[PDB]
């Protein structure tokens, strides 16, 4: 079963870990990652709120916007952290730790 | 070369004898339920009642219809009859005591049910009046919904055992009857078989047709319905109750020919059909289709998921 | 022989599909086309796809077409190419296939077990090529929400 | 409040509740039990 | 008489000020 | 094969016996139900191969099939809340 | 999730957003607690948010979006080409949703399903761009085409809706049928359906053989099929008719989004599975046919939508002329033309949509837009002159680099017909524009004017068109990167 | 000779379907049934090829195109039944 991680491009940065497990990445987050997550969730909730003031469901639209926001933000943060764990992104503090 | 037509005749004729005595026993046992005896005059015990009814419907002065009087009206009853019987082709009565070991039997049975739907719809429309056409559409919709439910149930019983030909299934049950663990699945499959032939609580299409035509045509149609009934009973006991396998596996049961066990199970299920017929009022059409599309589809799907789950976590899956 | 029978039936029935009036006649001949095509596939040696052609092509689509054309019943508003492909001398002359008929080399080693086409197809389709199986989910979902948004007032 | 709403919904729609519970059981068994069993087989 | 009495709007305003603060922090981490 | 030959001989013999027995005396609701059936019937078609081969596929097979089921189940939920299967 | 699906994060997110929006819309559209809200606007804004998020994920993640090399190579391969094409597609979809927000409320048709399909076909096209197998290509095309089939016949109480939708459905299904038979014949004669295998089996050694007569039929049918979906000017049946019938957001999305996708797919196949002259010749003919037809039809039209249809046919033609040869400069100019055309057409549809209701169907209703709304008239003139040709604009620069590449590539014949259809288009249009201060028969002072988002999108693109020539270095550079990394 | 016969049957059915969709222009039912016939012929020659050259992807493609055909037929008949309400 082709369950191997190799990329057509190459990890131009150091290669601290090739295929990190889930919990490792999601606990490897950085302050910038949480900021990205919070920003996405916030903008989503606000646009949901207004687009809900239009038809009178300010609440439920806020909840749905929140769901989409958490989904997108966590996916973006996990993507950034995974990149920094592999080499496809700048690694300074990850290399510091793994040293 | 000539053995095959002999086998086919030996499959066809006893089925007709059995279905005549089926409608007879139906009247008898519903009567006994309702604190009365059934037909008990003609025969020694009413045994000569179906023969007498057949002879009457034969000598009865026929009346040919006035609606597409050939190749579309004198064909559709024959179509549904042929479909019911060709379904009866692949059913195991004992080890190797089959007609054809079609290695994908289940798909075969499902397809034949759908073709029976075709039979009923064309027989309905081939008439002239339009209320029969509306009734035909209603029956078609009901039949096809409960067919999709039957399909999911088949998928469950198939997940429990690798292959598809029915003999392999009855071996899998030879370990332990699938009716035991999947008892709610059996109940759902039985309700779907009831709705599939419109028998016990789901009759409003036929009830309305009776509330608002050839003698031999109607005879052929009722014959097809009851034959399909026996078929559904047979496959229910062939894939959810053991299929010619003694209970408790003690070498005194092993003197019974095995074929007797299958007949006992299918007669029990026939008796259950007739019993559940004479105890319950009928649904409407609205509630009927609502239950079809709301209560049995989700339950069957959830059951597929659950059995797959339980049988994929442990090394119990062949 | 029987191959030719099924092919001829399918041909003439498709002709009637396109030409014959009383559109219910057309739908009947269409069902008949699909039935004989399923029998043909069965002759080819693929049983699963035959039963599937019966179930979803005939028992599912054609019943929808029959339903709709029922409710609107009152809405009544090559031999050259065959020779060019049979005169190529790249097809074995049947006289050759006769003696070579007793020349095939059974292996007796790839058939110690035997995957019926259903089993191997399941293997392949679900383990690998799975996105090829997720997309049809989306196209079926599109079908159903399209029917809803179109006709359901 | 949410518990009251859920009890209301379950009394109203029993069969959908039972279907969802069966599906939840059948999806919870593999996802969280298979790793535990593989680890148990690895240790014994 | 010294408060806002609309729950949904107040949740939305919390979300908006959180959004702006998060964007400012993100920029600060450019 | 060589079993569909008994099948078809059964077919023709049943035709003969049926003819013998015959000769002796001598809207949107429907459409949407049909569409839902055409959609859930390939569901059974796809569940058939998935059923037989859940031993040469690890939980990957179960999960892919559950994802398919989830997409079509969200389809069914959208169907339900719209009330198209109300009758 | 599992570190492999890191290669499909945009598609996973856009599908999950589509599902959550579908459920939200249906429940809170049928919930009696609130009045009976039709959630077109709210679902639309949430959809635009989800599309922007997809854009962000894909763009900022490409270098790890290429992470599942072989396990995904079973179906698709993602390179720089697919990266930039998908970005342009998501931009176009965000643009068309934002442009079409005000049409929903104005025309007053309530079905949030309209904005759960736009996303779904968007994911389909994202699959279609990064598609590396004949059947994956076909499946993506079918998903997209089904979404469009649903989208066409929206308003039932109208008249043109159903007939236009039915025409489009029959046409598209026929096209896909032809394409299927083509892929079938290629499979039968070749024995493979993955673009690497097709390349390795029929590159260089296209020399005629015993059973080589089969491959050719397959690729010919594939050409016809994919052509029908580029409006295929010998096969352009009903294209102006469906453009006129279907509503304006639908026809805008149909003009902008699928065409870029199918062009990227045509390029990906024509690099790999072509012949020495088969595909180039089956396109060299359609190119001149298209330019000629665009000219000699758009010269005489009396409906502001069909004029747009025939101008779209003409620009697709110019692009196909760019397709003629197969050198790096040529394909570079090809992609540049595609991009400029995408911008110009979202611009033109912005205008014709902001001029919608009071002008249900007319072309004479240029009722002194020079006098009742001068800035809008100047913008329309700018967009059209760019669409046809004039001293420095975007469309003129694109056509000029197209013909530069054509001349320098060894085809002295496409230029004459290209320049003459260009000059007849220019005479016609510059006669129309200078016909905007002769006199005015009709007057349609309009309640329409461009709420906020159509105006912003317009202003942006219109400032781009004129201001393109002062600095067109980065576009050339990125197009060079893309075309160079398409195969080399 | 049998691959020749199978393929020529598929081709003639395809030709018949396209002639139906071209000649008959108004009857939408015949039109959609001809589209179904075209997809059926494509499916059949897919299968014949999958079995002639020993290779499997023909059958996966066959199953998926069956799904596509069912979807097109359903949605197109919806288009028709809304066209014929007026
Ligand atoms: C972030 C900063 C900008 C916030 C904009 C809020 C919404 C503005 C649009 C609006 O509702 O205008 C009122 C207009 C019309 O309202 P109106 O004209 O009735 O307002 C006057 C009200 N009375 C008469 C009582 C004085 O609303 C609309 O056109 C429909 C609602 C559009 C809301 C769009 C919100 C999301 C947009 C993207 C956000 C990013
Ligand atoms: C891990 C898995 C653990 C499983 C534990 C057990 C869970 C079982 C859940 C499924 C039960 C299946 C059997 C009941 C069923 O299907 O009920 C559906 C439904 C129950 O729903 P209902 O429709 O009756 O509900 C009442 C009506 N409403 C919906 C308005 C509230 O049963 C019926 O509708 C009965 C129809 C008539 C049947 C008449 C024939 C009876 C034949 C003999 C039966 C003995
Ligand atoms: C701040 C985000 C927010 O939700 O503000 C709510 C408040 C109050 O919401 P509101 O429901 O009173 O009205 C907002 C909607 N408009 C603007 C169309 C009237 O809105 C704003 O602050 C919007 C303007 C500032 C945006 C920066």
mmCIF file of C-alpha atoms in Angstrom, chain G residues 208-445:
data_model
loop_
_atom_site.group_PDB
_atom_site.id
_atom_site.type_symbol
_atom_site.label_atom_id
_atom_site.label_comp_id
_atom_site.label_asym_id
_atom_site.label_seq_id
_atom_site.Cartn_x
_atom_site.Cartn_y
_atom_site.Cartn_z
ATOM 1 C CA UNK G 208 1.594 3.814 -38.832
ATOM 2 C CA UNK G 209 1.236 0.147 -37.937
ATOM 3 C CA UNK G 210 -1.195 -2.757 -38.231
ATOM 4 C CA UNK G 211 -3.566 -1.781 -35.405
ATOM 5 C CA UNK G 212 -2.456 1.855 -35.309
ATOM 6 C CA UNK G 213 -5.720 2.821 -37.025
ATOM 7 C CA UNK G 214 -7.509 2.639 -33.679
ATOM 8 C CA UNK G 215 -5.607 5.170 -31.571
ATOM 9 C CA UNK G 216 -6.280 7.848 -34.163
ATOM 10 C CA UNK G 217 -10.050 7.432 -33.970
ATOM 11 C CA UNK G 218 -9.900 7.756 -30.202
ATOM 12 C CA UNK G 219 -7.873 10.940 -30.219
ATOM 13 C CA UNK G 220 -10.050 12.400 -32.982
ATOM 14 C CA UNK G 221 -13.195 11.776 -30.960
ATOM 15 C CA UNK G 222 -11.534 13.252 -27.869
ATOM 16 C CA UNK G 223 -10.730 16.331 -29.942
ATOM 17 C CA UNK G 224 -14.327 16.701 -31.108
ATOM 18 C CA UNK G 225 -15.588 16.220 -27.567
ATOM 19 C CA UNK G 226 -13.298 18.647 -25.781
ATOM 20 C CA UNK G 227 -14.006 21.023 -28.662
ATOM 21 C CA UNK G 228 -17.760 21.045 -28.045
ATOM 22 C CA UNK G 229 -16.902 22.296 -24.544
ATOM 23 C CA UNK G 230 -14.838 25.167 -25.950
ATOM 24 C CA UNK G 231 -17.961 26.096 -27.983
ATOM 25 C CA UNK G 232 -16.343 24.582 -31.081
ATOM 26 C CA UNK G 233 -17.449 27.106 -33.724
ATOM 27 C CA UNK G 234 -18.386 24.468 -36.343
ATOM 28 C CA UNK G 235 -20.310 22.888 -33.439
ATOM 29 C CA UNK G 236 -21.411 26.134 -31.751
ATOM 30 C CA UNK G 237 -25.094 25.192 -32.039
ATOM 31 C CA UNK G 238 -27.345 27.046 -29.569
ATOM 32 C CA UNK G 239 -24.399 28.688 -27.764
ATOM 33 C CA UNK G 240 -25.736 32.245 -28.243
ATOM 34 C CA UNK G 241 -29.218 30.878 -27.587
ATOM 35 C CA UNK G 242 -28.280 29.409 -24.205
ATOM 36 C CA UNK G 243 -26.238 32.513 -23.383
ATOM 37 C CA UNK G 244 -29.351 34.598 -23.972
ATOM 38 C CA UNK G 245 -31.780 32.268 -22.222
ATOM 39 C CA UNK G 246 -29.940 31.374 -19.034
ATOM 40 C CA UNK G 247 -29.746 34.090 -16.351
ATOM 41 C CA UNK G 248 -26.811 36.457 -16.190
ATOM 42 C CA UNK G 249 -24.841 35.048 -13.211
ATOM 43 C CA UNK G 250 -25.176 31.551 -14.637
ATOM 44 C CA UNK G 251 -24.009 32.562 -18.097
ATOM 45 C CA UNK G 252 -21.159 34.600 -16.613
ATOM 46 C CA UNK G 253 -19.901 31.651 -14.597
ATOM 47 C CA UNK G 254 -20.373 29.409 -17.633
ATOM 48 C CA UNK G 255 -18.264 31.737 -19.768
ATOM 49 C CA UNK G 256 -15.400 32.340 -17.342
ATOM 50 C CA UNK G 257 -14.866 29.274 -15.164
ATOM 51 C CA UNK G 258 -15.238 26.132 -17.319
ATOM 52 C CA UNK G 259 -13.328 27.556 -20.273
ATOM 53 C CA UNK G 260 -10.069 28.107 -18.387
ATOM 54 C CA UNK G 261 -10.378 24.644 -16.854
ATOM 55 C CA UNK G 262 -10.955 22.875 -20.146
ATOM 56 C CA UNK G 263 -8.147 24.883 -21.744
ATOM 57 C CA UNK G 264 -5.714 23.754 -19.070
ATOM 58 C CA UNK G 265 -6.910 20.196 -19.611
ATOM 59 C CA UNK G 266 -6.523 20.509 -23.387
ATOM 60 C CA UNK G 267 -2.988 21.771 -22.899
ATOM 61 C CA UNK G 268 -2.141 18.920 -20.521
ATOM 62 C CA UNK G 269 -3.376 16.370 -23.052
ATOM 63 C CA UNK G 270 -2.027 18.002 -26.223
ATOM 64 C CA UNK G 271 1.462 18.111 -24.750
ATOM 65 C CA UNK G 272 1.295 14.376 -24.030
ATOM 66 C CA UNK G 273 -1.076 12.343 -26.178
ATOM 67 C CA UNK G 274 -1.135 14.088 -29.554
ATOM 68 C CA UNK G 275 0.077 13.357 -33.080
ATOM 69 C CA UNK G 276 2.407 15.230 -35.387
ATOM 70 C CA UNK G 277 -0.472 17.032 -37.072
ATOM 71 C CA UNK G 278 -3.774 15.553 -35.838
ATOM 72 C CA UNK G 279 -4.635 17.848 -32.939
ATOM 73 C CA UNK G 280 -2.822 20.878 -34.356
ATOM 74 C CA UNK G 281 -4.754 20.521 -37.605
ATOM 75 C CA UNK G 282 -8.116 19.880 -35.952
ATOM 76 C CA UNK G 283 -7.518 23.140 -34.074
ATOM 77 C CA UNK G 284 -5.927 25.196 -36.869
ATOM 78 C CA UNK G 285 -9.240 24.895 -38.719
ATOM 79 C CA UNK G 286 -11.490 25.757 -35.785
ATOM 80 C CA UNK G 287 -9.363 28.820 -35.019
ATOM 81 C CA UNK G 288 -9.902 30.499 -38.385
ATOM 82 C CA UNK G 289 -13.520 29.364 -38.423
ATOM 83 C CA UNK G 290 -13.990 30.979 -35.013
ATOM 84 C CA UNK G 291 -12.399 34.309 -35.853
ATOM 85 C CA UNK G 292 -14.384 34.529 -39.091
ATOM 86 C CA UNK G 293 -17.646 33.618 -37.359
ATOM 87 C CA UNK G 294 -17.128 36.051 -34.501
ATOM 88 C CA UNK G 295 -16.534 38.851 -36.979
ATOM 89 C CA UNK G 296 -19.303 38.136 -39.470
ATOM 90 C CA UNK G 297 -21.889 37.479 -36.741
ATOM 91 C CA UNK G 298 -21.118 40.074 -34.062
ATOM 92 C CA UNK G 299 -21.149 42.616 -36.891
ATOM 93 C CA UNK G 300 -24.958 42.283 -36.900
ATOM 94 C CA UNK G 301 -26.738 41.613 -33.610
ATOM 95 C CA UNK G 302 -29.606 43.326 -31.818
ATOM 96 C CA UNK G 303 -29.432 41.813 -28.323
ATOM 97 C CA UNK G 304 -26.734 42.825 -25.853
ATOM 98 C CA UNK G 305 -26.335 39.230 -24.665
ATOM 99 C CA UNK G 306 -25.850 37.463 -28.001
ATOM 100 C CA UNK G 307 -23.272 40.113 -28.867
ATOM 101 C CA UNK G 308 -21.401 39.010 -25.747
ATOM 102 C CA UNK G 309 -21.768 35.371 -26.805
ATOM 103 C CA UNK G 310 -20.278 35.959 -30.233
ATOM 104 C CA UNK G 311 -17.487 38.111 -28.832
ATOM 105 C CA UNK G 312 -16.680 35.258 -26.441
ATOM 106 C CA UNK G 313 -16.602 32.859 -29.387
ATOM 107 C CA UNK G 314 -14.247 35.262 -31.146
ATOM 108 C CA UNK G 315 -11.835 35.514 -28.240
ATOM 109 C CA UNK G 316 -11.857 31.753 -27.705
ATOM 110 C CA UNK G 317 -10.931 31.665 -31.372
ATOM 111 C CA UNK G 318 -7.977 34.006 -30.946
ATOM 112 C CA UNK G 319 -6.802 31.828 -28.057
ATOM 113 C CA UNK G 320 -7.079 28.720 -30.222
ATOM 114 C CA UNK G 321 -4.978 30.456 -32.884
ATOM 115 C CA UNK G 322 -2.395 30.933 -30.180
ATOM 116 C CA UNK G 323 -2.664 27.179 -29.660
ATOM 117 C CA UNK G 324 -1.515 26.468 -33.226
ATOM 118 C CA UNK G 325 2.138 25.560 -32.722
ATOM 119 C CA UNK G 326 3.820 24.003 -29.700
ATOM 120 C CA UNK G 327 6.806 26.126 -28.723
ATOM 121 C CA UNK G 328 7.455 27.727 -25.345
ATOM 122 C CA UNK G 329 6.858 31.296 -26.506
ATOM 123 C CA UNK G 330 3.601 30.177 -28.099
ATOM 124 C CA UNK G 331 2.130 28.499 -25.033
ATOM 125 C CA UNK G 332 3.320 31.446 -22.940
ATOM 126 C CA UNK G 333 1.312 33.853 -25.062
ATOM 127 C CA UNK G 334 -1.543 31.338 -24.972
ATOM 128 C CA UNK G 335 -1.822 31.417 -21.188
ATOM 129 C CA UNK G 336 -1.455 35.200 -21.121
ATOM 130 C CA UNK G 337 -4.380 35.471 -23.515
ATOM 131 C CA UNK G 338 -6.465 33.134 -21.365
ATOM 132 C CA UNK G 339 -5.903 35.311 -18.304
ATOM 133 C CA UNK G 340 -6.631 38.615 -20.039
ATOM 134 C CA UNK G 341 -9.808 37.100 -21.462
ATOM 135 C CA UNK G 342 -10.968 35.958 -18.029
ATOM 136 C CA UNK G 343 -10.578 39.474 -16.658
ATOM 137 C CA UNK G 344 -12.246 41.165 -19.616
ATOM 138 C CA UNK G 345 -15.246 38.873 -19.491
ATOM 139 C CA UNK G 346 -15.904 39.200 -15.768
ATOM 140 C CA UNK G 347 -15.735 42.943 -16.449
ATOM 141 C CA UNK G 348 -18.204 42.844 -19.337
ATOM 142 C CA UNK G 349 -20.611 40.695 -17.365
ATOM 143 C CA UNK G 350 -20.358 43.063 -14.408
ATOM 144 C CA UNK G 351 -21.541 45.826 -16.730
ATOM 145 C CA UNK G 352 -24.292 43.909 -18.516
ATOM 146 C CA UNK G 353 -25.511 42.724 -15.116
ATOM 147 C CA UNK G 354 -25.571 46.234 -13.669
ATOM 148 C CA UNK G 355 -27.686 47.143 -16.708
ATOM 149 C CA UNK G 356 -30.183 44.323 -16.309
ATOM 150 C CA UNK G 357 -33.760 44.859 -15.221
ATOM 151 C CA UNK G 358 -35.038 47.953 -17.037
ATOM 152 C CA UNK G 359 -33.382 46.517 -20.169
ATOM 153 C CA UNK G 360 -34.755 42.947 -20.001
ATOM 154 C CA UNK G 361 -33.549 42.314 -23.580
ATOM 155 C CA UNK G 362 -32.268 45.229 -25.701
ATOM 156 C CA UNK G 363 -29.170 46.735 -27.330
ATOM 157 C CA UNK G 364 -30.678 50.054 -28.344
ATOM 158 C CA UNK G 365 -30.947 50.848 -24.634
ATOM 159 C CA UNK G 366 -27.693 52.724 -24.652
ATOM 160 C CA UNK G 367 -29.983 55.598 -23.867
ATOM 161 C CA UNK G 368 -27.398 58.324 -23.437
ATOM 162 C CA UNK G 369 -25.308 56.497 -20.883
ATOM 163 C CA UNK G 370 -22.872 59.195 -21.930
ATOM 164 C CA UNK G 371 -25.406 61.639 -20.462
ATOM 165 C CA UNK G 372 -27.255 59.820 -17.674
ATOM 166 C CA UNK G 373 -24.208 58.027 -16.246
ATOM 167 C CA UNK G 374 -20.996 59.136 -17.971
ATOM 168 C CA UNK G 375 -18.460 57.170 -15.921
ATOM 169 C CA UNK G 376 -20.325 53.946 -16.635
ATOM 170 C CA UNK G 377 -20.378 54.703 -20.355
ATOM 171 C CA UNK G 378 -16.640 55.391 -20.348
ATOM 172 C CA UNK G 379 -16.087 52.112 -18.511
ATOM 173 C CA UNK G 380 -18.185 50.184 -21.021
ATOM 174 C CA UNK G 381 -16.256 51.736 -23.893
ATOM 175 C CA UNK G 382 -12.969 50.834 -22.202
ATOM 176 C CA UNK G 383 -14.003 47.226 -21.640
ATOM 177 C CA UNK G 384 -15.274 46.786 -25.199
ATOM 178 C CA UNK G 385 -12.303 48.430 -26.900
ATOM 179 C CA UNK G 386 -10.140 46.128 -24.806
ATOM 180 C CA UNK G 387 -12.306 43.223 -25.934
ATOM 181 C CA UNK G 388 -11.644 44.078 -29.591
ATOM 182 C CA UNK G 389 -8.522 46.209 -29.963
ATOM 183 C CA UNK G 390 -7.137 49.746 -29.711
ATOM 184 C CA UNK G 391 -3.861 51.480 -28.686
ATOM 185 C CA UNK G 392 -2.493 50.198 -25.426
ATOM 186 C CA UNK G 393 -5.050 48.203 -23.485
ATOM 187 C CA UNK G 394 -5.025 44.662 -22.142
ATOM 188 C CA UNK G 395 -6.796 42.904 -25.005
ATOM 189 C CA UNK G 396 -4.705 44.665 -27.637
ATOM 190 C CA UNK G 397 -1.481 43.732 -25.843
ATOM 191 C CA UNK G 398 -2.635 40.121 -25.556
ATOM 192 C CA UNK G 399 -3.538 39.832 -29.240
ATOM 193 C CA UNK G 400 -0.274 41.513 -30.199
ATOM 194 C CA UNK G 401 1.851 39.054 -28.262
ATOM 195 C CA UNK G 402 -0.266 36.214 -29.671
ATOM 196 C CA UNK G 403 0.495 37.257 -33.239
ATOM 197 C CA UNK G 404 4.136 37.937 -32.382
ATOM 198 C CA UNK G 405 4.463 34.352 -31.176
ATOM 199 C CA UNK G 406 2.540 32.989 -34.164
ATOM 200 C CA UNK G 407 4.782 34.765 -36.680
ATOM 201 C CA UNK G 408 7.938 33.745 -34.869
ATOM 202 C CA UNK G 409 6.759 30.127 -34.668
ATOM 203 C CA UNK G 410 6.430 29.393 -38.386
ATOM 204 C CA UNK G 411 2.812 30.133 -39.332
ATOM 205 C CA UNK G 412 2.456 33.076 -41.727
ATOM 206 C CA UNK G 413 -1.260 32.405 -42.244
ATOM 207 C CA UNK G 414 -3.081 32.933 -38.949
ATOM 208 C CA UNK G 415 -2.000 36.575 -38.756
ATOM 209 C CA UNK G 416 -3.836 37.863 -41.883
ATOM 210 C CA UNK G 417 -7.180 36.374 -40.875
ATOM 211 C CA UNK G 418 -6.576 37.332 -37.243
ATOM 212 C CA UNK G 419 -5.709 40.929 -38.024
ATOM 213 C CA UNK G 420 -8.578 41.342 -40.481
ATOM 214 C CA UNK G 421 -11.195 39.979 -38.088
ATOM 215 C CA UNK G 422 -9.633 42.264 -35.475
ATOM 216 C CA UNK G 423 -9.921 45.291 -37.743
ATOM 217 C CA UNK G 424 -13.527 44.599 -38.705
ATOM 218 C CA UNK G 425 -14.320 44.206 -35.013
ATOM 219 C CA UNK G 426 -12.550 47.488 -34.315
ATOM 220 C CA UNK G 427 -14.401 49.359 -37.044
ATOM 221 C CA UNK G 428 -17.724 48.034 -35.778
ATOM 222 C CA UNK G 429 -17.089 48.803 -32.110
ATOM 223 C CA UNK G 430 -15.513 52.222 -32.654
ATOM 224 C CA UNK G 431 -18.539 52.996 -34.803
ATOM 225 C CA UNK G 432 -20.807 51.942 -31.946
ATOM 226 C CA UNK G 433 -18.963 53.999 -29.331
ATOM 227 C CA UNK G 434 -18.874 57.098 -31.517
ATOM 228 C CA UNK G 435 -22.597 56.419 -32.015
ATOM 229 C CA UNK G 436 -23.072 57.385 -28.345
ATOM 230 C CA UNK G 437 -23.196 61.134 -28.928
ATOM 231 C CA UNK G 438 -25.136 61.337 -32.190
ATOM 232 C CA UNK G 439 -28.650 61.201 -30.724
ATOM 233 C CA UNK G 440 -30.748 59.064 -28.393
ATOM 234 C CA UNK G 441 -34.117 57.444 -29.228
ATOM 235 C CA UNK G 442 -34.860 55.662 -25.954
ATOM 236 C CA UNK G 443 -34.050 56.473 -22.343
ATOM 237 C CA UNK G 444 -33.980 54.060 -19.408
ATOM 238 C CA UNK G 445 -32.809 56.015 -16.347
#
